[PDB]
DNA sequence: CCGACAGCGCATCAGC
DNA sequence: GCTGATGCGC
DNA sequence: GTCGG
């Protein structure tokens, strides 16, 4: 309400940079501007005011001046009207159709879901699945269903092998009221850094979840990452739930908690902890925390047996996932 | 004035 | 057949 | 597009 007109503007501009211009850094640029503006607790009155925010520069300030004085942005209006650009932008909403496939399709007259349905032979497997669940995938997942999806995932994982450790991360683990998908982090004691993976630890879990008909489709699957589709069993009385996106990553046990830390987020929080970790003389990524020598050389990964272990290393009090908004 | 902006697993394409 | 590049999603 | 070396 404060600046929703501005952030919608910037978001639309962002999508067009990503899907049509293929300028991924401009996409993140506009997105970064939209975020910071979303958090500014004042109704912006001028481009110059906005420019004071980190991530808002000259150009976006000019655009805000124009939107403020007129209620629209000329570039955006033109783009909206544009047949090619809007079709290209629309097709990328299909999972598996990126900017390049979307451009190709539109070049050959394929520009609607209907056109996609009429040329299914020109779609790979991932795209067909995305096409199939176009509507369901754009739906959000209420926490209540996320909790009914977790039960299922934790139950069947333990059913396969009770030494398995599984953690539903993402914004769900931070307490969020809804989710966009489900991100599962999987480990097993038999799988470590310098070790075997019994190259079937992941497959086994994916198989069992297919068995009880939770996982309904597969977008991709290897020895360490599964990307797929799942669906809560329908009540017997009422509407069947929409199909959801689920990812499952098998991680080495000695890297599990760094992984859980990282995929729990949030992104802002990961930025801070890693920045703090550096100032404290540690380097933190997805996999490990390592000490930094005097000449800047990273030593071997330190032992980690919980999220808290990491916090202790960099001398900060353990923060609850609920409190990692930033 | 100009390069960074995250980077990696998996599917599939390009090319040998 | 293979390796390496690209597209994609996260 | 924005930031910063
Ligand atoms: Na700024
Ligand atoms: Na897409």
Q: Which nucleotides of B are covered by protein (CB under 7 A)?
A: 4-6, 9-13
Backbone angles phi, psi at A273, to 5 degrees: -60, -35
Single residue among A53, A82, A111 that ends a domain in this structure: A82
Asked whether residue A115 falls in the same domain as residue A169, the answer is: no
A82 in a known ligand binding site: no
- The CA distance from A15 to A20, in Å, is 8
**Maximum CA pair distance of chain A?**
67
Pair of tokens at residue A150: 């977790």
Any residues with CB less than 8 A from the CB of A179 and at least 6 apart, and which?
A140, A141, A143, A146, A170, A171, A172
Place of tokens 């995929």: A263
Q: Which nucleotides of D are covered by protein (CB under 7 A)?
A: 1-3
Pairing status of strand A165-168 against strand A244-250: unpaired
Quick one: which ligand is closest to A134's CA? 2
Pairing status of strand A244-250 against strand A182-187: parallel
The upper half-sphere exposure of residue A73, i.e. CA atoms within 13 Å in the direction of its Cβ, equals 21
A205 with A211: CB under 8 angstroms? no
- The CA distance from A32 to A44, in Å, is 17
SS3 A306: coil
Asked whether residue A19 falls in the same domain as residue A65, the answer is: yes
What CATH number does residue A297 fall under?
Answer: 3.30.210.10
Q: C-alpha distances in angstroms, A197 versus A112, A155, A192, A257, A258?
A: 43, 22, 8, 18, 19
User: Breaks in chain A at C–N > 2.5 Å: after which residues?
Assistant: none
A183 in a known ligand binding site: yes
A140 in a known ligand binding site: yes
Asked whether residue A256 falls in the same domain as residue A301, the answer is: no
Query: Quick one: A288 exposed, middle or buried, by C-beta within 10 A (0-12, 13-18, 19+)?
Result: buried
SS3 A182: strand
- The CA distance from A286 to A100, in Å, is 29
Asked whether residue A58 falls in the same domain as residue A164, the answer is: no
- Clarify whether A63 is annotated catalytic: yes
Method used to solve the structure: X-ray
Query: Quick one: A301 exposed, middle or buried, by C-beta within 10 A (0-12, 13-18, 19+)?
Result: middle
Any residues with CB less than 8 A from the CB of A276 and at least 6 apart, and which?
A314, A316
Pair of tokens at residue A297: 């050389």
What CATH number does residue A35 fall under?
Answer: 1.10.150.110
Closest CA to A167 of A148, A145, A182: A182
Residue A149 DSSP class: H
Closest CA to A174 of A146, A152, A215, A145: A146
Nearest-CA residue relative to C1' of B10: A220
Asked whether residue A301 falls in the same domain as residue A267, the answer is: yes
Asked whether residue A214 falls in the same domain as residue A289, the answer is: no
CA A321 to chain centre: 17
- The CA distance from A287 to A255, in Å, is 5
- The CA distance from A164 to A188, in Å, is 5
- The CA distance from A138 to A127, in Å, is 15
- The CA distance from A85 to A78, in Å, is 10
Asked whether residue A14 falls in the same domain as residue A68, the answer is: yes
- The CA distance from A182 to A248, in Å, is 8
Q: C-alpha distances in angstroms, A116 versus A105, A128, A212?
A: 9, 9, 31
Pairing status of strand A225-230 against strand A178-179: unpaired
* 3-state SS track over A196-224: CCCCCHHHHHHHHHHHCCCEEEEEEECCC
How long, in residues, is chain A? 326
Quick one: which ligand is closest to A29's CA? 1
CA of A66 to the centre of ligand 1 (A): 17
A33 with A60: CB under 8 angstroms? yes
What CATH number does residue A116 fall under?
Answer: 1.10.150.20
- The CA distance from A152 to A158, in Å, is 10
The β-bridge partners of A306 are none
Q: Give the nucleotide nearest to A202 (CA→C1').
A: B9
Single residue among A45, A64, A82 that ends a domain in this structure: A82
CA A314 to chain centre: 27
Helix (H) or strand (E) holding A178: strand A178-179
CA of A50 to the centre of ligand 1 (A): 7
Asked whether residue A239 falls in the same domain as residue A186, the answer is: yes
Q: C-alpha distances in angstroms, A73 versus A31, A63, A67, A220?
A: 17, 7, 6, 40
Asked whether residue A132 falls in the same domain as residue A222, the answer is: no
Domain region containing A108 = 83-139
Residue A296's region, left for phi above 0, alpha for psi from -120 to 50, else beta, is left
Asked whether residue A107 falls in the same domain as residue A179, the answer is: no
Q: C-alpha distances in angstroms, A289 versus A33, A274, A292, A315?
A: 31, 10, 10, 13
Based on the structure, what is the number of domains in chain A? 4
Helices H, strands E: what count in chain A?
A: 16, 9
The β-bridge partners of A230 are A215, A244
A13 with A62: CB under 8 angstroms? no
Asked whether residue A251 falls in the same domain as residue A272, the answer is: no
Residue A219's region, left for phi above 0, alpha for psi from -120 to 50, else beta, is alpha
What CATH number does residue A247 fall under?
Answer: 3.30.460.10
Asked whether residue A269 falls in the same domain as residue A218, the answer is: no
Any residues with CB less than 8 A from the CB of A155 and at least 6 apart, and which?
none
Pair of tokens at residue A223: 């020895």
Backbone angles phi, psi at A303, to 5 degrees: -60, 135
Single residue among A206, A236, A262 that ends a domain in this structure: A262
CA A199 to chain centre: 27
């Amino acid at each position: 309400t404060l600046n929703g007109g501005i952030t919608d503007m910037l978001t639309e501009l962002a999508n067009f940079e990503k899907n049509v211009s293929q300028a991924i850094h401009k996409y993140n640029a506009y997105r970064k501007a939209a975020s910071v503006i979303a958090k500014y607790p004042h109704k912006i009155k001028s481009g110059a005011e906005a420019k004071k925010l980190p991530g808002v520069g000259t150009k976006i300030a000019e655009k805000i001046d124009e939107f403020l004085a007129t209620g629209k942005l000329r570039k955006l209006e033109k783009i909206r009207q544009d047949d090619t650009s809007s079709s290209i932008n629309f097709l990328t909403r299909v999972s598996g159709i990126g900017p390049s496939a979307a451009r190709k399709f539109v070049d050959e007259g394929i520009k609607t879901l209907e056109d996609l349905r009429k040329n299914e032979d020109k779609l790979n497997h991932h795209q067909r699945i995305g096409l199939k669940y176009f509507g369901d995938f754009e739906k959000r997942i209420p926490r209540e269903e996320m909790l009914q999806m977790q039960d299922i995932v934790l139950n069947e994982v333990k059913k396969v092998d009770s030494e398995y450790i599984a953690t539903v991360c993402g914004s769900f683990r931070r307490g969020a009221e809804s989710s966009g998908d489900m991100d599962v982090l999987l480990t097993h004691p038999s799988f470590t850094s310098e070790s075997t993976k019994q190259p079937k630890l992941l497959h086994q879990v994916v198989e069992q979840l297919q068995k009880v008909h939770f996982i309904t489709d597969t977008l991709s699957k290897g020895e360490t990452k599964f990307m797929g589709v799942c669906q809560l069993p329908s009540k017997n009385d009422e509407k069947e739930y929409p199909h959801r996106r689920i990812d499952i990553r098998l991680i080495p046990k000695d890297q599990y908690y760094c992984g859980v830390l990282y995929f729990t987020g949030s992104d802002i929080f990961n930025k801070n902890m890693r920045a703090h970790a550096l100032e404290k003389g540690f380097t933190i990524n997805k996999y490990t925390i390592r000490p930094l020598g005097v000449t800047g050389v990273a030593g071997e990964p330190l032992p980690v047996d919980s999220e808290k272990d990491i916090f202790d290393y960099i001398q900060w009090k353990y923060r609850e996932p609920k409190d990692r908004s930033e």
